Amino acid sequence: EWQENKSWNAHFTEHKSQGVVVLWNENKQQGFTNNLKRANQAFLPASTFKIPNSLIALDLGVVKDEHQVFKWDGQTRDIATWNRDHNLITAMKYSVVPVYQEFARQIGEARMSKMLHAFDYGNEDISGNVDSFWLDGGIRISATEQISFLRKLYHNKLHVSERSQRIVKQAMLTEANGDYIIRAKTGYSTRIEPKIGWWVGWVELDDNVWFFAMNMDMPTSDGLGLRQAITKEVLKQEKIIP
Amino acid sequence: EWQENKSWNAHFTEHKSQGVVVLWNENKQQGFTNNLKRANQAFLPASTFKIPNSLIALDLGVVKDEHQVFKWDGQTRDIATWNRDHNLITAMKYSVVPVYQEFARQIGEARMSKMLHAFDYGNEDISGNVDSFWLDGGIRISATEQISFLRKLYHNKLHVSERSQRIVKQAMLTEANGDYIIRAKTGYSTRIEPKIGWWVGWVELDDNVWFFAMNMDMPTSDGLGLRQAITKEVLKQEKIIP
């Protein structure tokens, strides 16, 4: 059911990095990882929390649809792309924390808590600020728990409308060509050690789906591009993408 | 409102071809084409008809969803990719005519006709076989009429469920990266002269949508790759994609 493939450590080694890639072959119901222990180590979800946050926001009508504009609050922040208006598509793409903090406040802690329990999402713990707990509060999730959650979203099995699930899956769209589609979400946890980068989602093929969840040590933002590069090196080695 | 840009003819000429590209800037409500007359010349839609056919099939419950398997009928045809099971995603991707002919028969001519009128689709004429009229019957549509129809689909304004429209737009997904998303459908009209290639759809940007509809003379299948190559040359020249 779960197999360790330590040869993938060569892709981390090549980039002077360390972390885990977890793959799940949906057709065969079989998982693969370079490190079973790290696969099951729970971290702050950081911006990967935008997936469940989007679903809850849409289902409660905090977000009407993927076109509704969320006005920049006019406070210049660190990331140029944050200092503008966004919709759900662009807010996901650019990981626009302030937009999702506003979602979180409107959702409120009672409903956020009930929904993470219904989703069976990581440790289901929202302790801290309703608008920052995924950055510095109690919520923790492993690579393998990310895959469990993503599988429910792919199959429209989460306790929200089909419509909410379709809209978030649209919002997750990251890459597509004639060979594959990637629906995914990046994350960078900086507020508590260890500082990690996340990439979680799935590769749609004609005849299969490969779920993936990877995290890696991210001492500085310089290595953030390694999240995708290392995941793709593994996907290429396993012949999942050309 | 409409501007002719004959410089795009250079991209057709380079590939020893003739045809039209029509662009529509959604934000500015402004169209551009290399040939205003050909932009308005109606042809058989061929496999571009898979867009309205999918919508009507989904709305009537002929197709439950994008995962439902359409069993190969076991008749070896000319196109390898047709001789296998398909779902809506793979049937669109590979233009699997036999699957859509079966949809057409279950829809039936009364409902097919009522739906094309509701969609204001080309000349709204289904004369011919209910299961081949888009290949050799009476239906005709121009590049500009394709854009009018696509705009209604993009905005969920067609007289079918939001769900049907979302599923077909998912099924149209052709290419995505960090710069743009292309949702589109290819077509090759071969059964009545002149033989033409179609590519119709849109480019999603962060802050805008560019609708496109192109057709070109396609005497042999050798040039089918020119549909995308020439459209992209135009999109690149207009700085819509890098």
Phi and psi for A216 in degrees, rounded to 5? -150, 155
Lookup: tokens for B115: 């739906």
Which pairs from B1-6 meet CB under 8 Å and 24+ separation?
Answer: B1/B29, B1/B30, B1/B31, B2/B30, B2/B31, B2/B32, B2/B33, B2/B36, B3/B30, B3/B31, B3/B32, B3/B33, B4/B33, B4/B34, B4/B35, B4/B36, B5/B32, B5/B33, B5/B34, B6/B34, B6/B35
The one-letter amino acid at A109: E
Tokens 């995603």 correspond to what residue?
B89
> Residue B31 and residue B210: Cα distance in Å, rounded?
9
Contact A43, A215 (CB under 8 A): yes
Does residue B148 have a known ligand-binding role?
no
Query: In this complex, do A181 and B176 lie within 8 Å of one another by their Cβ atoms?
Result: yes
Lookup: tokens for A102: 């506003």
Query: In this complex, do A176 and B178 lie within 8 Å of one another by their Cβ atoms?
Result: no
Best interface-test mutation with A: which of B166, B186, B203 has the largest number of A CBs within 10 A?
Answer: B166
Query: In this complex, do B173 and A162 lie within 8 Å of one another by their Cβ atoms?
Result: no
- Maximum alpha-carbon separation in chain B: 51
Q: How crowded is the C-beta side of B67, counted as CA atoms within 13 Å?
A: 6
State the binding site of A for a beta-lactam. Answer: 47, 50, 95, 227
SS3 at position A85:
coil
SS3 at position A8:
helix
Query: In this complex, do B177 and A181 lie within 8 Å of one another by their Cβ atoms?
Result: no
Nearest to B22 by CA among B225, B141, B200: B200
SS3 at position B159:
coil
Lookup: tokens for A204: 């749609």
Rounded to an integer, what is the distance from CA A127 to the centroid of its chain?
Answer: 20
Phi-psi group of A14: left, alpha or beta (phi > 0 → left; psi -120 to 50 → alpha; rest → beta): alpha
The one-letter amino acid at A138: G
A-B contacts at Cβ under 8 angstroms: 36
Contact A204, A149 (CB under 8 A): no
Q: Compute the residue count for chain A.
A: 242
> Residue A132 and residue A15: Cα distance in Å, rounded?
31
Computed on alpha carbons and rounded to an integer, the radius of gyration of chain A in Å comes to 17
> Residue B238 and residue B40: Cα distance in Å, rounded?
21
Lookup: tokens for B135: 């290949």
Cα angle, residue A29 at apex, residues A28 and A31 outer, rounded to 5°? 105
Does residue B232 have a known ligand-binding role?
no
Q: Where are the domains of chain B?
A: 2-237
Nearest to A197 by CA among A40, A17, A77, A52: A17
Contact B103, B128 (CB under 8 A): no
Contact A221, A29 (CB under 8 A): no
Q: Return the number of other C-beta atoms located less than 10 Å from residue A215's C-beta.
A: 29
Lookup: tokens for A206: 């004609």
SS3 at position A71:
coil
State which approach was used to obtain the coordinates: X-ray
Residue A173 has its nearest CB partner, among B89, B166, B181, at: B181
Nearest to A187 by CA among A125, A126, A100: A100
> Residue B79 and residue B83: Cα distance in Å, rounded?
7
Contact B38, B9 (CB under 8 A): no
Residue B177 has its nearest CB partner, among A163, A167, A175, at: A175
> Residue A69 and residue A64: Cα distance in Å, rounded?
10
Nearest CA in chain B to A93: B178
Cα distances (angstroms) measured from residue B101 to each of A50, B111, B217: 41, 15, 25
> Residue A91 and residue A77: Cα distance in Å, rounded?
14
Whether residue A124 lies within 8 A of chain B, CB to CB, comes out as no
Alpha helices in chain B (DSSP H): 9-14, 36-39, 50-60, 88-93, 97-107, 109-118, 133-136, 143-154, 162-171, 226-237
Nearest CA in chain A to B162: A163
Nearest to B84 by CA among A25, A206, A190, A203: A206
Lookup: tokens for A34: 């370079």
Alpha helices in chain A (DSSP H): 9-14, 36-39, 50-60, 88-93, 97-107, 109-118, 133-136, 143-154, 162-171, 226-237
SS3 at position B209:
strand
How do strand B2-4 and strand B30-33 relate by DSSP bridges? parallel
Q: Return the number of other C-beta atoms located less than 10 Å from residue B170's C-beta.
A: 18
**Domain A2-237 bears CATH identifier 3.40.50.300:** no
Breaks in chain B (C–N beyond 2.5 Å) sit after: none
Residues 200-219 on B with a CB inside 8 Å of A are 204, 206
CA torsion A86→B181→B121→B102, rounded to 10°? -130
SS3 at position A222:
helix
Q: B109 to chain A, minimum CA–CA distance in Å? A: 30
